[PDB]
Symmetry: C2
Subunit: 140 residues, 2 copies
């Protein structure tokens, strides 16, 4: 049964700031957790934050992690928590940007019961498609 | 000679937060300005922030704006400033993410003579390529 909990994760306050961007553009949202990794912190503090974020969702919810980068402690600890909970469906998407977050909120509204693995493909596509340049000739 | 000044621009505190992410991974970076657009500000406030950010660079510097969202207010006021300073080389890339910012920093280190029109293609490429998922079956 059910829903998708979203965890926004980053080095530094990035994840908190883009969570604000999203609430201005999209409005308030349920079942969103923010995990920041600050300079006075180590990997085990981050491990605790992820476990605490997952426990804030209902036991039936699938989990979508939107992470800053495919490297470093935020990504590594998200992957660890994913691998320690094989009875729970997880997806991690790296390269967090605002089109990605908007599309994640929309896919939840539209199609949350299809699962995190189904909705990820179009979240990825819109995140990439929203990277565009001016002047137009600079685009691939 | 001139080099590239970077403006990181967003709705809300996103831009300040990812600037912090960048400093945790890439140290202190010269000629980087942050432009945030907060819930209690309007377009004329924003326009002034962009003009002040551009004034922090040297007259011969080129300007690279990394913006959160295509056709958003940060993007629109950046485009306006670009059109008002036609004697300055300018580029705008939307879909701001941490791979994008990392590559922009790398480009300036490798070749301070490369202008914003030359470095844009690899910055866009790495910004898109950095968007990937686990499980890996969601990837191409």
């Amino acid at each position: 049964m059910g829903s998708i909990g979203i965890i926004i994760a980053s080095h530094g306050e990035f994840a908190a700031g883009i969570h604000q961007s999203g609430s201005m553009i999209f409005g308030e949202q349920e079942k969103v957790q923010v995990v920041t990794f600050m300079p006075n912190e180590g990997p085990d503090d981050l491990y605790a934050k992820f476990n605490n974020a997952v426990a804030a969702f209902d036991a039936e919810d699938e989990v979508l992690v939107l992470a800053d980068l495919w490297s470093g402690s935020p990504f590594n600890q998200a992957s660890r928590v994913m691998g320690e909970n094989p009875e729970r469906k997880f997806a991690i998407i790296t390269g967090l940007n605002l089109p990605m977050l908007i599309q994640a909120y929309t896919e939840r509204l539209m199609d949350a019961a299809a699962g995190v693995e189904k909705v990820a493909a179009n979240i990825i596509k819109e995140a990439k498609d929203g990277i565009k340049a001016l002047p137009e000739e600079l685009n691939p």
